[PDB]
From Swiss-Prot:
Residues 1-121 form the NTR domain. GO terms for biological process: cartilage development; cellular response to peptide; cellular response to UV-A; connective tissue replacement involved in inflammatory response wound healing; negative regulation of apoptotic process; negative regulation of catalytic activity; negative regulation of endopeptidase activity; negative regulation of membrane protein ectodomain proteolysis. This is Metalloproteinase inhibitor 1. Metalloproteinase inhibitor that functions by forming one to one complexes with target metalloproteinases, such as collagenases, and irreversibly inactivates them by binding to their catalytic zinc cofactor. Acts on MMP1, MMP2, MMP3, MMP7, MMP8, MMP9, MMP10, MMP11, MMP12, MMP13 and MMP16. Does not act on MMP14. Also functions as a growth factor that regulates cell differentiation, migration and cell death and activates cellular signaling cascades via CD63 and ITGB1. Plays a role in integrin signaling. The gene is TIMP1. PANTHER family: METALLOPROTEASE INHIBITOR (PTHR11844), METALLOPROTEINASE INHIBITOR 1 (PTHR11844:SF20). Keywords: Disulfide bond, Glycoprotein, Growth factor, Metal-binding, Metalloenzyme inhibitor, Metalloprotease inhibitor, Phosphoprotein, Protease inhibitor, Secreted, Signal, Zinc.
Amino acid sequence: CTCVPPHPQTAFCNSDLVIRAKFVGTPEVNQTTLYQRYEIKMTKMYKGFQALGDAADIRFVYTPAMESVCGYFHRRSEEFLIAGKLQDGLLHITTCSFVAPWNSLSLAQRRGFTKTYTVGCEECTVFPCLSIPCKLQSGTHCLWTDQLLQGSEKGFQSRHLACLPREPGLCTWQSLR
C-alpha cells in the first residue's frame, strides 16, 4: 500500500459519510470479494444525516482483506470517528482513511468534523509537502508542511488548523481554537 494519509479536512471533504461508532465484531472476511467486514454500533452521524435523516443506521464498514492493497486493520471500548467513502453500495475505508478514537481528537478536530471543515471543501485545497523542495502553486491552496515532520498527524496544521477562505482567491491556514 502506497497511500498517503490526508489532512482531517481533506478526509471530511472527500468522505460520503462521517460517523462515530464502536467496533463490536470480530471482523469477517468475505471469501468471494476478499473484503473484510467490521460490525459497528453507530452513535452519531456528522456528514450524511441530511440525506438519511434519523433513520440513519450504519452497522457495517468494509476494507480490503489484504494489507498490501490498503486494508485497515483495527488495533476495545472506544468510540471512533470514521470518515468513509461509499463504493458499490458499501461504506469503505482503507489504511489511509481518517479513523481514530474520538477521545484522541483535539477540540479543534472535533470542531472541524462537526462544524468547520465543510467551509473549505468547495474553495480550498490542502496541498502536499512531502519532500524539500515543495511549492505553493495556487492562492487557494494551503501547503501542508507538517508532512515533513516525523509526528505529522500531531503537527499544528494537522491538529489545530483548517484551510479556509480568507480573501477572494486566497485560502489560509486558520485556527479552529
